[PDB]
Amino acid sequence: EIPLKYGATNEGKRQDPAMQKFRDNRLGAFIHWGLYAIPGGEWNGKVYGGAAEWLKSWAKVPADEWLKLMDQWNPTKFDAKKWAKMAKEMGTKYVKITTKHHEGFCLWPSKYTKYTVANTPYKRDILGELVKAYNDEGIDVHFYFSVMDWSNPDYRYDIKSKEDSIAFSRFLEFTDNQLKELATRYPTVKDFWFDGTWDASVKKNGWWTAHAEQMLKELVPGVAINSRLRADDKGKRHFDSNGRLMGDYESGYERRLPDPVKDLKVTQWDWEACMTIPENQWGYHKDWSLSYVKTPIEVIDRIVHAVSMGGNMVVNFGPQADGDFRPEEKAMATAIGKWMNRYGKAVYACDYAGFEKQDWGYYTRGKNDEVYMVVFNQPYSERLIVKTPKGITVEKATLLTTGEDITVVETTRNEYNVSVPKKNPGEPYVIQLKVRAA
Numbered sequence: 001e002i003p004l005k006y007g008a009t010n011e012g013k014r015q016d017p018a019m020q021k022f023r024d025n026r027l028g029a030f031i032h033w034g035l036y037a038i039p040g041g042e043w044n045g046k047v048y049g050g051a052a053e054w055l056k057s058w059a060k061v062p063a064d065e066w067l068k069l070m071d072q073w074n075p076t077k078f079d080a081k082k083w084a085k086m087a088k089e090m091g092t093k094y095v096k097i098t099t100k101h102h103e104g105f106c107l108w109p110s111k112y113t114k115y116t117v118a119n120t121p122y123k124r125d126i127l128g129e130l131v132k133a134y135n136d137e138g139i140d141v142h143f144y145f146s147v148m149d150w151s152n153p154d155y156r157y158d159i160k161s162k163e164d165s166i167a168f169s170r171f172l173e174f175t176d177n178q179l180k181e182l183a184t185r186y187p188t189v190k191d192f193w194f195d196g197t198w199d200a201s202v203k204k205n206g207w208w209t210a211h212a213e214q215m216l217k218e219l220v221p222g223v224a225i226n227s228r229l230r231a232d233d234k235g236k237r238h239f240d241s242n243g244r245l246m247g248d249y250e251s252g253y254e255r256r257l258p259d260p261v262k263d264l265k266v267t268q269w270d271w272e273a274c275m276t277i278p279e280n281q282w283g284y285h286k287d288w289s290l291s292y293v294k295t296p297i298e299v300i301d302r303i304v305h306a307v308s309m310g311g312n313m314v315v316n317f318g319p320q321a322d323g324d325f326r327p328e329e330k331a332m333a334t335a336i337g338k339w340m341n342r343y344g345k346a347v348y349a350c351d352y353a354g355f356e357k358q359d360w361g362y363y364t365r366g367k368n369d370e371v372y373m374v375v376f377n378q379p380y381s382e383r384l385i386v387k388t389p390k391g392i393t394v395e396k397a398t399l400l401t402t403g404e405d406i407t408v409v410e411t412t413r414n415e416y417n418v419s420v421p422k423k424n425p426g427e428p429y430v431i432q433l434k435v436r437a438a
């Protein structure tokens with residue numbers, strides 16, 4: 001039904017090695033760094049509560065005046081090796097980096113616009129330095145790219161005339177030029193994560209979205225492309241008019257994750273969630289008292305939740321103007337890293353286990369049929385309920401960290417009580433199950 005020139009291309013999950021790597025990585029970090037870091041949510045004595053990276057919009061700053069922030073771009077504390085070390089110690093396996101946000105300032109020295117790092121006091125190719133430094137630590141790099149661009153007067157939100165259609169065609173060619181540049185200048189890039197593709201102008205030019213995906217896949221072998229890029233012949237986004245996923249993975253969940261009981265459909269495709277530490281700040285905002293700020297355990301909960309349902313999780317950071325990270329973000333990265341060093345066998349290279357969800361936490365499945373119980377909510381009963389699928393039995397339980405044997409008691413036909421450890425681990429913890437299928 002509904003025939004389409006620009007609808008889905010993959011049927012089912014890609015299983016080539018590059019997609020396996022994307023998937024197995026599981027845990028990433030996001031970097032939102034751009035001129036917005038300089039004002040940090042404040043303009044002319046007013047602190048705006050909205051997302052800092054959107055301050056141009058909240059304070060109604062004309063482009064030319066916003067882009068003059070370039071004269072203040074001088075992050076003297078920037079050190080790409082230090083950033084890569086922070087990422088490595090956090091336990092991230094990849095980093096997604098804002099190459100260009102809506103504002104249109106480029107973190108690489110683009111030859112297609114003057115609004116780049118090259119034309120700042122700092123001069124240096126930030127994106128290039130990061131690529132090298134993260135790659136040297138064995139960390140994959142993914143590129144965020146905003147199609148919407150507030151610095152280019154050829155951009156259009158909608159096509160309402162011939163003059164608009166011509167300006168927008170130029171814009172699309174400009175866009176292609178930047179994308180080709182990114183793909184050829186940084187050939188180790190593993191993914192392009194598009195944003196700012198929701199306007200009517202883009203929805204009417206589905207053909208371009210398909211072309212952008214194909215173009216990049218020809219330039220970068222095995223590259224992944226997110227769903228958000230893609231609009232079909234009819235302007236339907238992410239999933240085409242026949243309900244098929246466009247791009248290589250679904251990129252949708254930001255505020256909330258799929259429901260572990262009601263949204264099991266997501267296990268059928270690759271997907272990646274991205275999350276902020278405050279409620280809704282991606283770029284650096286100077287005042288984190290303005291909204292709820294997640295604790296490390298709340299973030300770890302979300303990371304395991306995503307992997308338990310077959311998805312990746314990416315934790316966002318908004319570096320300071322000076323090129324260092326704020327104390328709250330250093331604390332977060334360090335806490336996550338300490339937990340991942342202990343428990344990361346239940347995260348990396350893991351996936352949906354096919355077990356009925358229980359209240360204590362989440363299951364994940366390893367590559368050799370290990371089933372991990374990740375416990376976030378400790379039962380006063382001191383018993384962790386495990387209901388197995390038809391034909392599956394539990395043969396052993398072990399505490400991950402110490403190897404100590406944990407008692408498993410059959411309670412009914414398809415159900416066990418797995419005891420909690422003899423000593424309360426004092427933090428979310430992992431019990432590994434050995435299971436057998438009839």
Ligand SMILES: C[C@@H]1N[C@@H](c2nc3ccccc3[nH]2)[C@H](O)[C@@H]1O
Nearest residue numbers: 032051053054101195196274282
């Ligand atoms: C990953 C996130 N996507 C950007 C964005 N643009 C939006 C436009 C409308 C509503 C929400 C938006 N989030 C945010 O600035 C951030 O980059």
